């Protein structure tokens, strides 16, 4: 249950990564791939080589959710509604994946925004991303 | 540990350029402001009611140093990690009773500090070496638990 | 989440157990202390030896909240904030150590309410302490 | 996997006792119908609609057995499972595409349906040596992953 200080944070966080997210959803699902290859079992049909243009697009389009899950700081189960049934009706992720993802973009992000990651954002971005996984886990049952 | 040398010295090569005292402090910190609750295991370190007094806390910074000494000396011998750290695992089993879980935190915010001083420096390569490197440590740790 | 089928085989399952509750928290305690000695680092103010007393009666604690909450089911949360408070800050167990204690409670059930442990029963009970557990880990930071 | 003789010797008797037909199509039947989301990789397999037509379904029951059948091989080569699970290993990674998530609930299965044949018996040291037995295997099936 986030706090009106993690929000501030998520947003002013998300608010320096600007444009470049689909840069780093792409970075960050790379640096799962190679870290955690358990997570390719759910990308059988992806083009996982590095630098490939299916996995690059797909990165934006998390990070783009992720943009949108912000926007919709105080509703995100039901505005990541469609991305529940996802992830957990047709997709069924083992939640473990969520927890791993989470923790690359944190890498990534920390890669990229040196002076916005301070303790204090790290524990909010690290709260967020927590309840992102967490929605779109839920419908497991 | 199942450590290809290109992994092997990707991951020295870039321990050469850390500053313990520094990255020693910054993690335990941040372990400390992400994961409140395991600031039930130093009750002894005075003030960390608040993000600034833990960063700060000179018994932190004390703390994280003796840390990362254990961890250089991990990587100085990746090929007998259960034994490196085999005496310290039972002090945390037995004296100080933490669920080993909590290894996996620390090591997960270490990788999580490394790339915030590195940044592209830490590339996806490096840090597949480095996940490999703090789980070994994780699980060393977790091995005399009776 | 709870579905009123599973609800029905809970309450139907549970009511079994009936006056054995006590037992089989404890037997389960048992079992998880053996299985998964980590866990046994949250208990050093206890003596874990076989049978032994602290173990019996903190196995009829534990069963007496899981009745608890079969009684309220349709609202756990309610039910259980004080046990939840606990769990949470007071002693911040990490999640994990609840999907083996539920493991094995199922296995305690399992051995001794054979007739009554059909795979929907099996099921269900799944997603019941499935459901004890999340609710006990809701204020994890 | 640091298995003890009065541990090594637990598992293998009870074992003997077990009924493969019966028990490995309980096992691959208790997780099509509790952990739904298996059946997805089974949908060759035929209805898998409801409970009743789980547990009855003779695809279900064959496959069952030759799961337990595996099973029954890394009893016997307990000290090197690595090396025996190999090969499904690789199967179950490159053609079948399975998260090693997966495999724990399975075995765990496994000890919920051997508890519920046996009642007193599996006693709660019978079931940690199972426990052992069941982690090995799912790590040893997960070894090959890349
Ligand atoms: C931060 C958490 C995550 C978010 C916000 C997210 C977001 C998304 C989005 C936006 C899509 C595309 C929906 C569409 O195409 O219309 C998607 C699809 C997908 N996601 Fe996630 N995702 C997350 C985590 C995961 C993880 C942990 C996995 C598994 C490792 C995963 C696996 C997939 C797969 C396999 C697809 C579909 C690929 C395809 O068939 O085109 N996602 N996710
Ligand atoms: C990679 C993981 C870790 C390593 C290498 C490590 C290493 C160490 C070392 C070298 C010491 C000093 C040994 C001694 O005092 O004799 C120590 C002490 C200690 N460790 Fe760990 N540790 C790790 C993780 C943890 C975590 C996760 C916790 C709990 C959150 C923890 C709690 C403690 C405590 C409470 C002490 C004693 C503090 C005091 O009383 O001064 N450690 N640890
Ligand atoms: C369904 C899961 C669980 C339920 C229903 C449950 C219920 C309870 C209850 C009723 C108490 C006594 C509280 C009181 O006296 O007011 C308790 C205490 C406690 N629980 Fe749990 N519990 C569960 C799981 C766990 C888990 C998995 C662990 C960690 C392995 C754990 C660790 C503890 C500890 C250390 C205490 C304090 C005992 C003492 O110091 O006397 N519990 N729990
Ligand atoms: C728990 C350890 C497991 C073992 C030891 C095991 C064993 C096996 C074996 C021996 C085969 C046949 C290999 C052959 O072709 O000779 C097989 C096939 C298969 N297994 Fe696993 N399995 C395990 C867990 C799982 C998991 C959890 C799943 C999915 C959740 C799964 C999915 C499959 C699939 C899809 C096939 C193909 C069957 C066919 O030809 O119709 N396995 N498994």
Same mark, same amino acid.
């Given at each position: 249950?986030?706090?009106?200080?993690?929000?501030?944070?998520?947003?002013?966080?998300?608010?320096?990564?600007?444009?470049?997210?689909?840069?780093?959803?792409?970075?960050?699902?790379?640096?799962?791939?190679?870290?955690?290859?358990?997570?390719?079992?759910?990308?059988?049909? %992806?083009?996982?080589?590095?630098?490939?243009?299916?996995?690059?697009?797909?990165?934006?389009?998390?990070?783009?959710?992720?943009?949108?899950?912000?926007?919709?700081?105080?509703?995100?189960?039901?505005?990541?509604?469609?991305?529940?049934?996802?992830?957990?009706?047709?997709?069924?992720?083992?939640?473990?994946?969520?927890? #791993? #993802?989470?923790?690359?973009?944190?890498?990534?992000?920390?890669?990229?925004?040196?002076?916005?990651?301070?303790?204090?954002?790290?524990?909010?971005?690290?709260?967020?991303?927590?309840?992102?996984?967490?929605?779109?886990?839920?419908?497991?049952? | 540990?199942?450590?290809?040398?290109?992994?092997?010295?990707?991951?020295?090569?870039?321990?050469?350029?850390?500053?313990?005292?520094?990255?020693?402090?910054?993690?335990?910190?941040?372990?400390?402001?992400?994961?409140?609750?395991?600031?039930? %295991?130093?009750?002894?370190?005075?003030?960390?009611?608040?993000?600034?007094?833990?960063?700060?806390?000179?018994?932190?910074?004390?703390?994280?140093?003796?840390?990362?000494?254990?961890?250089?000396?991990?990587?100085?011998?990746?090929?007998? #990690?259960?034994?490196? %750290?085999?005496?310290?695992?039972?002090?945390?089993?037995?004296?100080?009773?933490?669920?080993?879980?909590?290894?996996?935190?620390?090591?997960?915010?270490?990788?999580?500090? #490394?790339?915030?001083?590195?940044?592209?420096?830490?590339?996806?390569?490096?840090?597949?070496?480095?996940?490999?490197?703090?789980?070994?440590?994780?699980?060393?740790?977790?091995?005399?638990?009776?």
């Amino acid at each position: 249950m986030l706090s009106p200080a993690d929000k501030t944070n998520v947003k002013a966080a998300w608010g320096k990564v600007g444009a470049h997210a689909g840069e780093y959803g792409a970075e960050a699902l790379e640096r799962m791939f190679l870290s955690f290859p358990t997570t390719k079992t759910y990308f059988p049909h %992806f083009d996982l080589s590095h630098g490939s243009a299916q996995v690059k697009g797909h990165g934006k389009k998390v990070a783009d959710a992720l943009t949108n899950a912000v926007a919709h700081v105080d509703d995100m189960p039901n505005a990541l509604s469609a991305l529940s049934d996802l992830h957990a009706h047709k997709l069924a992720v083992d939640p473990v994946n969520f927890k #791993l #993802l989470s923790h690359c973009l944190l890498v990534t992000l920390a890669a990229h925004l040196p002076a916005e990651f301070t303790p204090a954002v790290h524990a909010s971005l690290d709260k967020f991303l927590a309840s992102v996984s967490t929605v779109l886990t839920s419908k497991y049952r | 540990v199942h450590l290809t040398p290109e992994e092997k010295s990707a991951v020295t090569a870039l321990w050469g350029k850390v500053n313990v005292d520094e990255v020693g402090g910054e993690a335990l910190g941040r372990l400390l402001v992400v994961y409140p609750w395991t600031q039930r %295991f130093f009750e002894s370190f005075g003030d960390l009611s608040t993000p600034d007094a833990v960063m700060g806390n000179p018994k932190v910074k004390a703390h994280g140093k003796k840390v990362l000494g254990a961890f250089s000396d991990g990587l100085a011998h990746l090929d007998n #990690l259960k034994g490196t %750290f085999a005496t310290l695992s039972e002090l945390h089993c037995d004296k100080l009773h933490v669920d080993p879980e909590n290894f996996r935190l620390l090591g997960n915010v270490l990788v999580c500090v #490394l790339a915030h001083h590195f940044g592209k420096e830490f590339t996806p390569p490096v840090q597949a070496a480095y996940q490999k490197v703090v789980a070994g440590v994780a699980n060393a740790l977790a091995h005399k638990y009776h």
